[PDB]
CSV table of C-alpha atoms and ligand atoms in Angstrom, one decimal:
chain,number,residue,atom,x,y,z
X,7,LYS,CA,34.4,-25.3,10.0
X,8,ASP,CA,30.9,-24.0,9.2
X,9,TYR,CA,32.0,-20.6,10.6
X,10,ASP,CA,35.3,-20.3,8.6
X,11,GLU,CA,34.0,-18.0,5.8
X,12,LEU,CA,32.1,-15.8,8.3
X,13,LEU,CA,35.1,-15.4,10.6
X,14,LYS,CA,37.0,-13.9,7.6
X,15,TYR,CA,34.6,-10.9,7.8
X,16,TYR,CA,33.2,-10.8,11.3
X,17,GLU,CA,34.3,-11.3,14.9
X,18,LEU,CA,31.5,-13.2,16.7
X,19,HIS,CA,30.0,-12.3,20.0
X,20,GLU,CA,27.2,-13.5,22.3
X,21,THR,CA,24.2,-15.2,20.8
X,22,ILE,CA,21.2,-13.0,21.8
X,23,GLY,CA,18.4,-15.1,20.4
X,24,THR,CA,17.7,-18.8,19.9
X,25,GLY,CA,15.3,-21.4,18.4
X,26,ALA,CA,17.2,-19.6,13.3
X,27,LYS,CA,19.5,-18.2,16.0
X,28,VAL,CA,21.0,-14.7,16.2
X,29,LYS,CA,24.5,-13.7,17.2
X,30,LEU,CA,25.9,-10.2,17.8
X,31,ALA,CA,29.0,-9.6,15.8
X,32,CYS,CA,31.4,-6.9,14.6
X,33,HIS,CA,32.2,-6.2,10.9
X,34,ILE,CA,36.0,-6.0,10.8
X,35,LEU,CA,36.6,-3.7,7.8
X,36,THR,CA,34.3,-0.9,9.2
X,37,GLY,CA,34.2,-1.8,12.9
X,38,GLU,CA,30.4,-1.6,12.7
X,39,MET,CA,28.2,-3.8,15.0
X,40,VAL,CA,25.9,-6.3,13.2
X,41,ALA,CA,23.5,-9.1,14.0
X,42,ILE,CA,24.0,-12.4,12.3
X,43,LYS,CA,21.1,-14.7,11.7
X,44,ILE,CA,22.3,-18.3,11.5
X,45,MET,CA,20.1,-21.0,10.1
X,46,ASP,CA,20.7,-24.7,9.7
X,47,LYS,CA,20.0,-26.3,6.2
X,48,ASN,CA,19.7,-30.0,7.2
X,49,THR,CA,17.4,-29.5,10.2
X,50,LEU,CA,15.0,-27.7,7.8
X,51,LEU,CA,13.7,-24.0,4.0
X,52,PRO,CA,12.2,-22.1,1.1
X,53,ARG,CA,10.9,-19.8,3.8
X,54,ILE,CA,14.5,-18.6,4.0
X,55,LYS,CA,14.9,-18.1,0.3
X,56,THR,CA,11.6,-16.1,0.3
X,57,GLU,CA,12.9,-13.8,3.0
X,58,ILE,CA,16.4,-13.3,1.5
X,59,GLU,CA,14.8,-12.5,-1.9
X,60,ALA,CA,12.5,-10.1,-0.3
X,61,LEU,CA,15.2,-8.2,1.7
X,62,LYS,CA,17.5,-8.0,-1.4
X,63,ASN,CA,14.6,-6.1,-3.1
X,64,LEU,CA,13.5,-4.0,-0.1
X,65,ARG,CA,15.5,-1.2,1.3
X,66,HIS,CA,14.1,1.4,3.8
X,67,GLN,CA,14.7,3.5,6.9
X,68,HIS,CA,12.3,1.2,8.8
X,69,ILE,CA,13.3,-2.1,7.5
X,70,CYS,CA,16.1,-3.9,9.2
X,71,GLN,CA,18.8,-3.9,6.5
X,72,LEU,CA,20.3,-7.1,5.0
X,73,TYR,CA,24.0,-6.5,4.4
X,74,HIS,CA,25.3,-9.9,3.5
X,75,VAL,CA,24.2,-13.5,2.5
X,76,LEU,CA,26.8,-16.3,3.1
X,77,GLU,CA,26.0,-19.9,2.5
X,78,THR,CA,28.0,-23.0,3.5
X,79,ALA,CA,27.2,-26.7,3.0
X,80,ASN,CA,25.4,-26.8,6.3
X,81,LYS,CA,24.6,-23.1,7.3
X,82,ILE,CA,23.0,-20.0,5.9
X,83,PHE,CA,24.1,-16.7,7.4
X,84,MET,CA,22.2,-13.4,7.1
X,85,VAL,CA,24.1,-10.3,8.3
X,86,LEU,CA,21.5,-7.8,9.4
X,87,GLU,CA,21.3,-4.3,10.7
X,88,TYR,CA,22.0,-4.3,14.5
X,89,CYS,CA,19.1,-3.1,16.6
X,90,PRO,CA,20.2,-2.8,20.2
X,91,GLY,CA,16.8,-1.4,21.4
X,92,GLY,CA,15.2,-4.9,21.4
X,93,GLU,CA,11.7,-5.9,20.4
X,94,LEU,CA,8.6,-3.8,20.4
X,95,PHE,CA,7.0,-6.7,22.3
X,96,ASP,CA,9.3,-6.5,25.3
X,97,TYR,CA,8.9,-2.7,25.4
X,98,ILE,CA,5.1,-2.9,25.7
X,99,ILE,CA,5.5,-5.5,28.4
X,100,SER,CA,7.7,-3.1,30.4
X,101,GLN,CA,5.4,-0.1,30.0
X,102,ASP,CA,2.2,-2.1,30.3
X,103,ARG,CA,0.8,0.0,27.4
X,104,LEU,CA,1.8,3.0,25.4
X,105,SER,CA,0.0,6.4,25.6
X,106,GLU,CA,-1.8,7.4,22.4
X,107,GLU,CA,1.0,10.0,21.8
X,108,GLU,CA,3.8,7.4,22.1
X,109,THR,CA,1.7,4.8,20.1
X,110,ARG,CA,1.4,7.4,17.3
X,111,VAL,CA,5.2,7.9,17.2
X,112,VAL,CA,5.8,4.2,16.8
X,113,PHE,CA,2.7,3.5,14.6
X,114,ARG,CA,3.8,6.0,12.0
X,115,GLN,CA,7.1,4.1,11.6
X,116,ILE,CA,5.2,0.9,11.1
X,117,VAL,CA,2.9,2.4,8.5
X,118,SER,CA,5.9,3.9,6.7
X,119,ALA,CA,7.6,0.5,6.5
X,120,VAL,CA,4.5,-1.4,5.5
X,121,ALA,CA,3.3,1.2,3.0
X,122,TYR,CA,6.7,1.0,1.3
X,123,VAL,CA,6.6,-2.9,1.3
X,124,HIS,CA,3.3,-2.7,-0.5
X,125,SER,CA,4.6,-0.1,-2.9
X,126,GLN,CA,7.3,-2.7,-3.9
X,127,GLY,CA,4.7,-5.4,-4.6
X,128,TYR,CA,5.0,-7.4,-1.4
X,129,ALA,CA,2.9,-8.2,1.6
X,130,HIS,CA,4.6,-9.0,4.9
X,131,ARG,CA,1.9,-11.3,6.2
X,132,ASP,CA,3.3,-11.8,9.7
X,133,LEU,CA,3.2,-8.3,11.3
X,134,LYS,CA,3.4,-8.4,15.1
X,135,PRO,CA,5.5,-6.8,18.0
X,136,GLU,CA,8.1,-9.5,17.9
X,137,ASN,CA,8.8,-8.5,14.3
X,138,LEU,CA,9.6,-4.9,15.1
X,139,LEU,CA,12.9,-3.8,16.7
X,140,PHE,CA,14.3,-0.5,18.0
X,141,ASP,CA,17.6,0.7,16.8
X,142,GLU,CA,20.0,2.8,18.8
X,143,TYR,CA,18.1,6.0,18.0
X,144,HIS,CA,14.9,4.2,19.2
X,145,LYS,CA,13.7,4.0,15.5
X,146,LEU,CA,11.6,1.0,14.5
X,147,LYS,CA,13.0,-1.6,12.1
X,148,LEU,CA,10.8,-4.3,10.6
X,149,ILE,CA,12.1,-7.9,10.5
X,150,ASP,CA,11.3,-11.4,9.2
X,151,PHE,CA,10.0,-11.4,5.6
X,152,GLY,CA,9.9,-15.2,5.6
X,153,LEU,CA,6.1,-15.5,5.3
X,154,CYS,CA,5.8,-12.7,2.8
X,155,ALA,CA,3.9,-12.8,-0.5
X,156,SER,CA,0.6,-14.9,14.9
X,157,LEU,CA,-2.9,-16.3,14.5
X,158,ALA,CA,-3.9,-13.5,16.9
X,159,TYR,CA,-2.6,-11.2,14.1
X,160,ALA,CA,-4.1,-12.9,11.1
X,161,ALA,CA,-6.8,-11.2,9.0
X,162,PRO,CA,-10.1,-13.2,8.7
X,163,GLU,CA,-9.7,-13.7,4.9
X,164,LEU,CA,-6.1,-14.8,5.3
X,165,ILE,CA,-7.2,-17.4,7.8
X,166,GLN,CA,-9.9,-18.6,5.4
X,167,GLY,CA,-7.4,-19.1,2.5
X,168,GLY,CA,-2.7,-9.6,0.5
X,169,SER,CA,-2.2,-5.9,1.4
X,170,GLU,CA,-5.7,-5.7,3.1
X,171,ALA,CA,-4.5,-8.5,5.5
X,172,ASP,CA,-1.5,-6.3,6.5
X,173,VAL,CA,-3.9,-3.4,7.3
X,174,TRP,CA,-5.8,-5.8,9.6
X,175,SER,CA,-2.5,-6.9,11.3
X,176,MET,CA,-1.5,-3.3,11.8
X,177,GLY,CA,-4.9,-2.8,13.5
X,178,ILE,CA,-4.2,-5.6,16.0
X,179,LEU,CA,-0.8,-4.1,16.6
X,180,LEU,CA,-2.4,-0.6,17.1
X,181,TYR,CA,-4.8,-2.2,19.7
X,182,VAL,CA,-1.9,-4.0,21.5
X,183,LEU,CA,0.3,-0.8,21.7
X,184,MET,CA,-2.6,1.2,23.3
X,185,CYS,CA,-4.1,-1.6,25.4
X,186,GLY,CA,-1.2,-4.0,26.3
X,187,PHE,CA,-3.2,-7.2,25.3
X,188,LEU,CA,-4.8,-8.7,22.3
X,189,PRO,CA,-8.3,-7.8,20.9
X,190,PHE,CA,-8.8,-11.5,20.1
X,191,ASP,CA,-7.3,-14.2,22.2
X,192,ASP,CA,-8.1,-17.8,23.3
X,193,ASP,CA,-6.4,-21.0,24.6
X,194,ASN,CA,-8.1,-22.9,21.7
X,195,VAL,CA,-7.2,-22.1,18.1
X,196,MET,CA,-10.7,-22.8,16.7
X,197,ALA,CA,-12.3,-20.6,19.4
X,198,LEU,CA,-9.8,-17.9,18.5
X,199,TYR,CA,-10.5,-18.4,14.8
X,200,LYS,CA,-14.2,-17.8,15.6
X,201,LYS,CA,-13.6,-14.6,17.7
X,202,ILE,CA,-11.6,-13.2,14.8
X,203,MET,CA,-14.4,-14.1,12.3
X,204,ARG,CA,-17.0,-12.4,14.6
X,205,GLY,CA,-14.7,-9.3,14.9
X,206,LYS,CA,-16.0,-8.1,18.3
X,207,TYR,CA,-13.4,-7.0,20.9
X,208,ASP,CA,-13.3,-5.1,24.2
X,209,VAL,CA,-12.9,-1.3,23.8
X,210,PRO,CA,-11.0,-0.2,26.9
X,211,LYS,CA,-12.0,2.9,28.9
X,212,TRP,CA,-8.7,4.7,28.3
X,213,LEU,CA,-9.0,4.8,24.5
X,214,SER,CA,-9.8,8.2,22.9
X,215,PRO,CA,-12.8,8.5,20.4
X,216,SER,CA,-10.3,9.0,17.6
X,217,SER,CA,-8.3,5.8,18.6
X,218,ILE,CA,-11.6,3.8,18.7
X,219,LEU,CA,-12.6,5.1,15.3
X,220,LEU,CA,-9.3,4.2,13.6
X,221,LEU,CA,-9.3,0.7,15.2
X,222,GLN,CA,-12.8,0.2,13.9
X,223,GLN,CA,-11.8,1.1,10.4
X,224,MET,CA,-8.7,-1.1,10.4
X,225,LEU,CA,-10.4,-4.1,12.1
X,226,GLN,CA,-13.2,-4.6,9.6
X,227,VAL,CA,-13.8,-8.3,9.0
X,228,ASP,CA,-14.8,-7.7,5.3
X,229,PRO,CA,-11.5,-6.6,3.6
X,230,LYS,CA,-13.4,-4.4,1.2
X,231,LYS,CA,-14.9,-2.3,4.0
X,232,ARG,CA,-11.5,-1.9,5.7
X,233,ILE,CA,-9.5,1.3,5.4
X,234,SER,CA,-7.0,1.2,2.6
X,235,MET,CA,-3.3,1.7,3.0
X,236,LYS,CA,-3.4,5.0,1.0
X,237,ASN,CA,-6.1,6.4,3.3
X,238,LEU,CA,-4.2,5.3,6.4
X,239,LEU,CA,-1.2,7.5,5.4
X,240,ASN,CA,-3.1,10.6,6.0
X,241,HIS,CA,-5.8,9.5,8.5
X,242,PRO,CA,-6.9,12.2,10.9
X,243,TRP,CA,-5.5,10.1,13.8
X,244,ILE,CA,-2.2,9.5,12.1
X,245,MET,CA,-1.9,13.3,11.3
X,246,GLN,CA,-2.7,14.4,14.9
X,247,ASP,CA,0.2,16.5,16.3
X,248,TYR,CA,2.2,16.0,13.0
X,249,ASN,CA,0.1,17.7,10.4
X,250,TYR,CA,1.8,15.9,7.6
X,251,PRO,CA,1.1,12.4,6.1
X,252,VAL,CA,3.4,9.4,6.9
X,253,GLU,CA,6.6,9.6,4.8
X,254,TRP,CA,6.7,6.1,3.5
X,255,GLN,CA,9.0,6.6,0.5
X,256,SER,CA,12.4,5.1,1.1
X,257,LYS,CA,15.4,7.2,1.8
X,258,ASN,CA,18.3,4.6,1.4
X,259,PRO,CA,18.4,4.4,-2.5
X,260,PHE,CA,19.3,1.5,-4.8
X,261,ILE,CA,20.3,4.0,-7.6
X,262,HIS,CA,22.0,7.0,-6.0
X,263,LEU,CA,25.4,6.1,-4.6
X,264,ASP,CA,27.3,7.9,-1.9
X,265,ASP,CA,30.4,9.6,-3.3
X,266,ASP,CA,32.5,9.3,-0.1
X,267,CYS,CA,31.7,5.6,0.2
X,268,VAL,CA,32.5,5.0,-3.5
X,269,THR,CA,35.8,6.9,-3.0
X,270,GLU,CA,37.0,4.9,0.0
X,271,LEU,CA,36.0,1.6,-1.6
X,272,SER,CA,37.9,2.7,-4.8
X,273,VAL,CA,41.1,3.2,-2.9
X,274,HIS,CA,40.7,-0.3,-1.3
X,275,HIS,CA,39.8,-1.8,-4.7
X,276,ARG,CA,42.5,0.3,-6.5
X,277,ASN,CA,40.1,1.0,-9.3
X,278,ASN,CA,38.5,4.1,-10.8
X,279,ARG,CA,35.2,5.5,-9.5
X,280,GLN,CA,33.0,4.4,-12.4
X,281,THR,CA,34.3,0.8,-12.1
X,282,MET,CA,33.6,0.9,-8.3
X,283,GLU,CA,30.0,2.2,-8.9
X,284,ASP,CA,29.2,-0.5,-11.5
X,285,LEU,CA,30.6,-3.1,-9.0
X,286,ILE,CA,28.5,-1.7,-6.1
X,287,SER,CA,25.3,-1.4,-8.1
X,288,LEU,CA,25.2,-5.1,-8.9
X,289,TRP,CA,24.0,-5.5,-5.3
X,290,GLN,CA,25.1,-9.1,-4.8
X,291,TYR,CA,24.9,-9.0,-1.0
X,292,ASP,CA,28.4,-10.3,-0.7
X,293,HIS,CA,31.1,-8.6,1.4
X,294,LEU,CA,31.1,-5.6,-0.9
X,295,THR,CA,27.4,-5.0,-0.4
X,296,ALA,CA,28.0,-5.4,3.4
X,297,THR,CA,31.0,-3.0,3.4
X,298,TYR,CA,29.4,-0.4,1.2
X,299,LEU,CA,26.2,-0.4,3.2
X,300,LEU,CA,28.1,-0.4,6.5
X,301,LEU,CA,30.3,2.5,5.4
X,302,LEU,CA,27.1,4.4,4.6
X,303,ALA,CA,25.8,3.5,8.1
X,304,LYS,CA,29.1,4.6,9.6
X,305,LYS,CA,28.6,8.0,7.9
X,306,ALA,CA,25.0,8.5,9.0
X,307,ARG,CA,26.1,7.8,12.6
X,308,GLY,CA,28.5,10.8,12.1
X,309,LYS,CA,31.6,8.7,12.0
X,310,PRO,CA,34.4,9.0,9.3
X,311,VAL,CA,34.0,7.0,6.1
X,312,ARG,CA,37.0,4.8,6.8
X,313,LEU,CA,37.9,1.2,6.1
X,314,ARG,CA,40.4,-0.7,8.4
X,315,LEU,CA,42.8,-2.3,6.0
J,420,LIG,N1,9.6,-13.9,14.2
J,420,LIG,C1,10.8,-14.1,15.0
J,420,LIG,C2,12.0,-13.3,14.5
J,420,LIG,C3,13.3,-14.0,14.7
J,420,LIG,N2,14.2,-12.9,15.2
J,420,LIG,C4,15.2,-12.3,14.6
J,420,LIG,O1,15.5,-12.6,13.5
J,420,LIG,C5,15.9,-11.2,15.4
J,420,LIG,N3,15.8,-10.9,16.7
J,420,LIG,N4,16.6,-9.8,17.1
J,420,LIG,C6,17.3,-9.5,15.9
J,420,LIG,C7,16.9,-10.2,14.8
J,420,LIG,C8,17.4,-10.0,13.4
J,420,LIG,C9,18.0,-8.6,13.2
J,420,LIG,C10,18.5,-8.0,14.5
J,420,LIG,N5,19.3,-6.9,14.7
J,420,LIG,N6,19.5,-6.7,16.1
J,420,LIG,C11,18.8,-7.6,16.8
J,420,LIG,N7,18.6,-7.8,18.1
J,420,LIG,C12,19.2,-7.3,19.2
J,420,LIG,C13,18.6,-7.4,20.4
J,420,LIG,C14,19.1,-6.9,21.6
J,420,LIG,C15,20.3,-6.3,21.6
J,420,LIG,C16,21.0,-6.1,20.3
J,420,LIG,F1,22.2,-5.5,20.3
J,420,LIG,C17,20.5,-6.7,19.1
J,420,LIG,C18,18.2,-8.5,15.8
């Protein structure tokens, strides 16, 4: 009976992830695939409120989109953009490591998401390959804003008790993509803590001089000597082969609304377009937010803006 409300809107499928859990599901009104993050309230908690509040406020081409927050006596449900491509983590593992060229393709997407997160006044604080998914177009989507304002990924000053720390974590990520293993690792947490504080890591033979130089700028122990996010957007390495800076500004507006989506919702709601717009622009992350955003996603995927009434 904890699933009663949910089953009004979505048809559930197989659980894909466990231990929060994650279920694949279909949104009935649009027919769009989603992923539903299911969390127990008793067996847990403000970590969830943190995240939900973050995702309500963040909207971006490289952030896994929150469509819908449902809450029951026992459960909390988060209906999220469906990323069939799987984790960045598993993809590195299959390839062993990424080429510099492929690392750059991926890394630009990470910078874009993180630069935007910082622009909105947040720090992610838990950046790692497990927190990055590929959508059906092999585009990166950032997840899990629960620790936002993994020891392997933590900046020295964070460990010692905000946006500088993210730059450091992006550095570790950069290293992992190109190397296939951590720059700092150890069985023992305090030994790891010490390696991180010292800041010395193996520099593998296959890294280009330009890779090594970027790594060295991002992985500065002193946060004040560390490349800033602004300077990362147009770093020589980042610009290689692209010749334009990372486009970090969000498409996916809060203010501009899609006319076709407004129209189809208007006919469902049997109201006029101005009423429908005011209603959408409250962004309450109820079924309306879900349906609007899912109609928009239907449209981007080149499908007709159509509800199933
Ligand atoms: N720090 C640990 C993070 C916990 N993991 C997730 O929340 C999570 N893992 N995987 C997902 C999510 C939420 C959004 C999300 N959308 N699509 C997928 N996963 C997915 C994975 C494989 C096939 C597929 F169709 C979907 C997810």
